[PDB]
Ligand binder design. Structure first.
Ligand SMILES: Cc1cccc(C(=O)NCC(=O)O)c1
Length: 150
């Protein structure tokens, strides 16, 4: 009973979370997951400010109201070579990664590791936060409040 959460640097408090190495998060699960990091789904304005501080990924993830990819450098295989906050328009499917916003994070680029899941609740799952540098933090608990996500 294990969940891996790969996380990035934070940029103006915004970061990306990929669950179990695949697109696997629903919109309801994403809100609950960010809540476990004392965070919320970013607004489009919060995401645009994060982009301006250096944030880019090559993965679709939820923000409030849309599914996006923040892009700085044009790359043919990331958001069809677009720059800026690329908004997904047409898709058949509902599962993606998520972005989260922590208002207590530093204002600009914070590439230190994440070493806690401060607001997870009691539960049976071994949840492991995996940083890009490989460092890991694990705790037994749960964050999903909707039975359909479990
Ligand atoms: C768990 C998490 C995710 C992203 C960012 C942070 C963070 O810098 N918090 C500072 C604080 O709580 O005072 C924590």
């Amino acid at each position: 009973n294990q969940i891996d959460l790969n996380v990035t640097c934070r940029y103006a408090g915004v970061f990306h979370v990929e669950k179990n190495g695949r697109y696997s998060i629903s919109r309801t699960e994403a809100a609950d997951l960010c809540q476990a990091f004392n965070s919320t789904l970013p607004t489009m304005d919060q995401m645009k400010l994060a982009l301006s501080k250096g944030f880019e990924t090559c993965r679709y993830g939820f923000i409030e109201g849309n599914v996006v990819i923040p892009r700085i450098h044009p790359n043919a295989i990331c958001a069809a070579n677009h720059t800026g906050v690329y908004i997904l328009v047409t898709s058949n499917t509902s599962h993606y990664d998520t972005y989260c916003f922590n208002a207590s994070a530093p204002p600009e680029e914070d590439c230190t590791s994440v070493t806690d899941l401060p607001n997870s609740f009691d539960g049976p799952v071994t949840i492991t936060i995996v940083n890009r540098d490989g460092t890991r933090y694990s705790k037994k608990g749960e964050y999903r409040t909707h039975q359909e996500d479990i």
